[PDB]
Design a protein around this motif. Structure first.
Motif, PDB file in Angstrom:
ATOM      1  N   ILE A 203       1.012  -1.233   0.092  1.00  0.00           N
ATOM      2  CA  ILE A 203       0.128   0.155  -0.230  1.00  0.00           C
ATOM      3  C   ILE A 203       0.998   1.341  -0.110  1.00  0.00           C
ATOM      4  CG2 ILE A 203      -1.760   1.398   1.198  1.00  0.00           C
ATOM      5  CD1 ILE A 203      -2.727  -1.439   2.543  1.00  0.00           C
ATOM      6  N   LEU A 204       0.830   2.128  -0.921  1.00  0.00           N
ATOM      7  CA  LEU A 204       1.550   3.196  -1.115  1.00  0.00           C
ATOM      8  C   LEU A 204       3.346   2.861  -1.047  1.00  0.00           C
ATOM      9  CD1 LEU A 204      -0.376   6.101   0.594  1.00  0.00           C
ATOM     10  CD2 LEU A 204       0.013   5.629  -1.929  1.00  0.00           C
ATOM     11  N   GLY A 205       3.487   1.696  -1.714  1.00  0.00           N
ATOM     12  CA  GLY A 205       4.915   1.271  -1.832  1.00  0.00           C
ATOM     13  C   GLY A 205       5.437   0.808  -0.326  1.00  0.00           C
ATOM     14  N   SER A 206       4.363   0.441   0.452  1.00  0.00           N
ATOM     15  CA  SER A 206       4.734  -0.073   2.024  1.00  0.00           C
ATOM     16  C   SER A 206       4.284  -1.389   2.055  1.00  0.00           C
ATOM     17  CB  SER A 206       4.476   0.932   3.115  1.00  0.00           C
ATOM     18  OG  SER A 206       4.858   0.189   4.335  1.00  0.00           O
ATOM     19  N   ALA A 207       4.931  -2.302   2.668  1.00  0.00           N
ATOM     20  CA  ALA A 207       4.689  -3.389   2.902  1.00  0.00           C
ATOM     21  C   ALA A 207       3.947  -3.593   4.373  1.00  0.00           C
ATOM     22  CB  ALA A 207       5.782  -4.709   2.681  1.00  0.00           C
ATOM     23  N   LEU A 208       4.042  -2.677   5.148  1.00  0.00           N
ATOM     24  CA  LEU A 208       3.433  -2.346   6.554  1.00  0.00           C
ATOM     25  C   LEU A 208       2.405  -1.163   6.666  1.00  0.00           C
ATOM     26  CD1 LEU A 208       5.323  -0.191   7.998  1.00  0.00           C
ATOM     27  CD2 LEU A 208       6.915  -2.371   8.713  1.00  0.00           C
ATOM     28  N   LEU A 209       1.697  -1.044   7.634  1.00  0.00           N
ATOM     29  CA  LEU A 209       0.857   0.124   7.712  1.00  0.00           C
ATOM     30  C   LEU A 209       1.460   1.262   8.430  1.00  0.00           C
ATOM     31  CD1 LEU A 209      -2.077  -2.299   9.266  1.00  0.00           C
ATOM     32  CD2 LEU A 209      -1.753  -1.397   6.856  1.00  0.00           C
TER      33      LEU A 209
END
Ligand SMILES: Cc1ccncc1NC(=O)C[C@H](c1ccsc1)N1CCC(O)CC1
Ligand SMILES: Cc1ccncc1NC(=O)C[C@H](c1ccsc1)N1CCC(O)CC1
Lengths: 304, 304
Positions: free
Chosen positions: B281-287
C-alpha cells in the motif's frame, strides 16, 4: 543510531524557486545567476497538448509574455531560448541567493532530493531515486512542474532533475537541467507506458549494510554465493544485475562491518527466496532500494 | 499523484543553526532573536555523566565559557540561564535570519520534520513522529544534540523538539524548546527503558485514505464496524484506541473519498487480522503511522 530516508537540507534550493506564468499557465522556475529554467510546456494551450510544436508555439511568445515572480517581486525578462525541453529566461538581475551549482545528468539507481513547489513556493522535501525505467516515484500535483531534484556536496548544489510529467500510471517523468528527458518520455499528452520497474540491487545491499550497522542483524546467514549465482536469482526477482563495479562501491561498507559483499549477496538471496516471514529491517517490511552506498556512508558518518 | 514521507522545507531552520562548545563538548544550538537554545548537557564532563547536578556544574561556567559560532563567525555571549533541560545563551546580536516562530509542545501521534545537524551545520532533513511512548525514531549520531524538530505554517516555524539523548535501544529522547523532556526521560547516562511502541491508529487511517486518493484500493472491503468493536481489535494489535475526536479529524478525508470513517476502520481491522498477503500500500509492506490526517490533506492538496 537509527536510519531514515533523509533529504538534503533544502535552503539553498528554496532561494532559487520562482513562479513562471505564460498566458494562463503558472508553474515553477529555477533562478540561477541571471537565468530562470522552466519546463517548455509552460507555453502550451489545452487544445494543443496532444501534439504541440514547441518551436512554432514559441514564435508567438515574446520576453514580456513570460511573467517571472521571485517572492512578491517581478523579474524583468530580457531574453528567452529553448534548450531541448526547457526554456531559459534571461532576466536582468542575478539571483542574489545563487548557491555554487552544477548541472548533472544522473544514472538510474542514483538518489536525489526533490523540493516540491507550487506557485514558486516550496511545499516539502523528499528523497527520490531515478528508477531503472527512468521514471521517479514522486509526490507531485498539478502546478508542481518545474520543481527540481538535486544532490549537495558541502556548498555545491548539483541539480539533476526538473519535473515535467505525470504518466497515466501515477509515476513521474522529467528532464536534467539541459532539458533532456530521462528515459524515452516526451512532453506531450500521449500514451507513454513505463518499462519494468526493477529493484536497484546495489542500493538494497547498501541498505542491508546500514541495517547491520544499526543493529538489525537477523537476516545474516551462514552462506555465501558468487556474482554469477547471485545474478541468476536477481534476474528471477526483477532485480538489476550486480556488477564488479557495484561490489567495489560497497567496499567501504564491507570493510566497516566485516561482512564480505558476496556474503551479503547470499543473505539478500535468502531474503528473496524466503521472504521476511513477517519480520522487518530498519522499520521496513520490504527491501528498500532508494539508498545508495554513498547515502548509507553519509548518513552513518554524519557528513554536513 | 504519488505519496511520499515529506519533510517541511528546512531553509528557515538552517538559518538558525549554530555551534555551541563548552570545554571539550561541541553540539548544536538554535539561534532565535538574541538567544541561543541548546541542551544543558553541553556542560557535562565524562566522569560525571552518570549523576550530573546541572545547577552545581553551571556555577563553574561563565558567559565566556560558551563558544557560539554561527557559520565561521563568533557570537558574543552576554548572559546564560538554565530553563529545565535547556540552556539559553543571550548573545549580543539578534539572528538576522530569525523566522516568525513559536515554541509548541506536541502530543504523541503528531509528526514533525527534523533537521539533523553536526557542528552547527545541517546534514539532512527527515520526517518524524512523537511515538506514543514519547520517544522518536530518528537518525542521530554523536554530535547531533541540539538538532531540532519543527512544523511550518506558511511563514511561521513552530519548534517542537530538541534532540538530547540516544536510549540504549537506539531510539531517541528530547525536549520541547522550554527544556521539558517528552516522556519520563532524563538527561543522564542511566538505564532508561522505553514503554510500548504502539501504532498511531488515526495516522494509519489517514494514510489508508491517502492510499485510496492515490489509487491503491485493493484493501477496501464490504464491511463496516463500530468504534467499540474496532477498539477491541486495536487493543489486541497494540494500536492506540480510536476516539470520536480522531473520527472528527478524519472527516475531511472521509468527505473527499466518500468512505465513512467506520468503513475505513473495518478495512484496517481486516488488514490487522489477515495481514497484507504479500501485497503493498503506497509502496509499503506495513501499515504506515507517521502521517497525520493534516499531513495527508496538506500533501494531497499542495499547501505551500
Ligand atoms: C498534472 C500533473 C500532475 C503531477 N505532475 C505533473 C503534472 N503535469 C503534467 O503531467 C503536464 C501535462 C502537460 C502540460 C502541457 S503538455 C503536457 N499535463 C498538464 C495538466 C493537464 O491536466 C494534463 C497534461
Ligand atoms: C551519543 C548520541 C547518539 C545519538 N543521539 C544522541 C547522542 N547523545 C546522547 O545520548 C547524550 C549523552 C549524554 C551527554 C551528557 S549526559 C548524557 N551521551 C553523550 C555521548 C556519550 O558517548 C554517551 C552519553
Amino acid at each position: 543510531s537509527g536510519f531514515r530516508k533523509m533529504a538534503f537540507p533544502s535552503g539553498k534550493v528554496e532561494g532559487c524557486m520562482v513562479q513562471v506564468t505564460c498566458g494562463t499557465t503558472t508553474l515553477n522556475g529555477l533562478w540561477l545567476d541571471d537565468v530562470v529554467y522552466c519546463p517548455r510546456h509552460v507555453i502550451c494551450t489545452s487544445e494543443d497538448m496532444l501534439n504541440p510544436n514547441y518551436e512554432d508555439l514559441l514564435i508567438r511568445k515574446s520576453n514580456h509574455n513570460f511573467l517571472v515572480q521571485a517572492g512578491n517581486v517581478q523579474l524583468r525578462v530580457i531574453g528567452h531560448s529553448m534548450q531541448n525541453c526547457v526554456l531559459k529566461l534571461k532576466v536582468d538581475t542575478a539571483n542574489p541567493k545563487t548557491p555554487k551549482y552544477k548541472f548533472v545528468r544522473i544514472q538510474p539507481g542514483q538518489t536525489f532530493s526533490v523540493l516540491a513547489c507550487y506557485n514558486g513556493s516550496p511545499s516539502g522535501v523528499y528523497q527520490c531515486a531515478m528508477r531503472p525505467n527512468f521514471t521517479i516515484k514522486g509526490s507531485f500535483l498539478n502546478g508542481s512542474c518545474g520543481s527540481v531534484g538535486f544532490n549537495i556536496d558541502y556548498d555545491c548544489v548539483s541539480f539533476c532533475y526538473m519535473h515535467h510529467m505525470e504518466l497515466p500510471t501515477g509515476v513521474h517523468a522529467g528532464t536534467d537541467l539541459e532539458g533532456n528527458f530521462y528515459g524515452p518520455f516526451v512532453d506531450r499528452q500521449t500514451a507513454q507506458a513505463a518499462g519494468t520497474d526493477t529493484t536497484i540491487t546495489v542500493n538494497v545491499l547498501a541498505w542491508l549494510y546500514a541495517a547491520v550497522i544499526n543493529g538489525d542483524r537477523w537476516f545474516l546467514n551462514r552462506f555465501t554465493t558468487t556474482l554469477n549465482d547471485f545474478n541468476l536469482v536477481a534476474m528471477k526477482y526483477n532485480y538489476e544485475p550486480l556488477t564488479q563495479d557495484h561490489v567495489d562501491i560497497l567496499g567501504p561498507l564491507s570493510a566497516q562491518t566485516g561482512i564480505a559483499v558476496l556474503d551479503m549477496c547470499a543473505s539478500l538471496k535468502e531474503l528473496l527466496q524466503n521472504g521476511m516471514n513477517g519480520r522487518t529491517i530498519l522499520g521496513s517490511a520490504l527491501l528498500e532500494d532508494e539508498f545508495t552506498p554513498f547515502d548509507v556512508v553519509r548518513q552513518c558518518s554524519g557528513v554536513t
